[PDB]
Amino acid sequence: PLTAEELERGQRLGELLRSARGDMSMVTVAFDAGISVETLRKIETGRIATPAFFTIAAVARVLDLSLDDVAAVVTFGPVS
Amino acid sequence: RVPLTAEELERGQRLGELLRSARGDMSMVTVAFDAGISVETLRKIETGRIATPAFFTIAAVARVLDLSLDDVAAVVTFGPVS
Known part of the structure; x- marks a missing residue:
């Protein structure tokens, strides 16, 4: 099973x-990233137990986000 | 079975390299211990044997290696090719 701290990070990520x-x-985001809307929906809503690196990398690219920044706030929460 | 596409396998292999x-x-x-994974997992990641590498796993290994995920993601393309 997934861990509490693992499903927290999922929620942080999706948000x-x-x-x-x-x-x-x-x-438009899904098309530019090359993923399904369903996947994107599940990620945004925190329903994926272990999101794929390349899925998050593709969305981050389209959305002009630093992956290092993403990683830091999945594992620690956002500020403040 | 859902097969990987040529592009997916190749991205996995580049990431591993x-x-x-x-x-x-x-x-x-030491890498596996500090990242919180098995040596078997790290081996498979390094050699492109994991079908869909997990974001949190790659993040943990990159942090241990003082490697920026943005620098890593830069070697690949996503989406319409054009």
């Missing part, structure tokens, strides 16, 4: 990505 |  998407459409 | 080069002379056991 960060959703925020970065802002008003951009889910369809 | 980059992590292996970053490890350099450092011990696989």
Whole structure:
């Protein structure tokens, strides 16, 4: 089973990505990243137990986010 | 079975090669221990034998290796090719 601290990070991750998407459409982000809307939806909502590195890397690219920044706040929470 | 695409396998292999080069002379056991994974997992990652490497695993290994994930992600393409 996934750990408590693992499902927390999932939620943190999804919230960060959703925020970065802002008003951009889910369809356009998914197309530019090469993933499904379903996957993107699941990630944004924290429903994926272990998201794939290349999935997060692709979304981050499209959304102009640093992966190092992403990693830091999944594992530690956002500020403040 | 869902097969990988040529592009997926190749990205996995590039990622593995980059992590292996970053490890350099450092011990696989030490890397695996500090990242919180098995040597078997690190071996498979380094040699491109994991079908879908997990974000949190790659992040942990990169941190141990003082390697920036942005620098690593830079070697690949995502999306329309064009």
